[PDB]
């Protein structure tokens with residue numbers, strides 16, 4: 652039974668389900684307990700055992716080594732109307748959207764540290780065969796003591812493949828023009844677009860495009876002082892033609908990305 656976790660308060664709820672704070676009774680491990688209604692589940696999937704499960708579980712197991720840039724699935728249960736996942740919970744922790752709301756635009760140095768960590772994490776998912784598809788500030792947690800970001804919510808994700816996707820259920824205003832115009836995208840180039848949006852969100856304090864037409868026109872106006880190198884990087888990720896977008900390798904070799912702080916230094920200077 653799930654009588655082996657003590658449940659605390661609701662942390663948040665939405666398209667990902669309802670997520671509660673918890674503590675594993677076994678060892679007082681802090682956890683997050685996520686509930687997902689079977690009626691509301693997008694894709695389903697295939698475990699070795701043979702058992703049928705939400706794609707989210709498959710995706711999380713494919714990725715849940717101990718690399719700390721992606722949230723670790725500790726356990727899961729099936730209930731009559733629902734699945735419950737036990738996830739690791741850092742503490743103290745704060746979600747990036749909150750951090751930006753409280754802080755406004757982030758200094759470049761801290762945006763760089765954070766953006767590099769997000770890139771390492773997304774490369775991790777891709778090497779484990781998983782496409783997140785909903786990269787944005789709300790799906791990123793900051794472990795405030797260690798200065799470590801973790802990607803969460805794989806509920807809109809998919810197995811990574813090299814052919815075209817024609818379905819999408821993440822967030823529209825993070826989605827690339829080719830989704831909006833043709834309902835087709837490739838995994839990596841769409842991911843790069845959404846990383847451009849994310850990076851703009853960090854340095855300007857808000858997303859650049861509210862509407863379909865703005866996404867499709869792809870003109871980027873900066874409302875804050877942002878350095879030329881960072882503007883270049885963002886505009887490159889936000890190229891209209893997918894194949895003009897940089898690879899992960901070209902983004903991590905970009906001049907704006909050099910000399911990144913280690914996560915612990917980041918915590919010491921900007922979060923402690």
Ligand SMILES: CN1CCCN(C(=O)c2cccc(-c3ccc(/C=C4/C(=O)Nc5ccc(Cl)cc54)o3)c2)CC1
Nearest residue numbers: 662663664667670683738739740744745746749803804
């Ligand atoms: C505005 N209000 C006040 C600030 C304090 N505060 C936070 O920033 C805060 C701190 C920790 C978590 C969350 C939060 C909300 C929604 C979720 C969703 C999760 C999910 O889908 N998978 C997960 C795995 C691990 C964890 Cl820890 C959370 C999730 O997580 C939010 C509440 C917001």
Ligand SMILES: [Cl-]
Nearest residue numbers: 819822823826
């Ligand atoms: Cl959409």
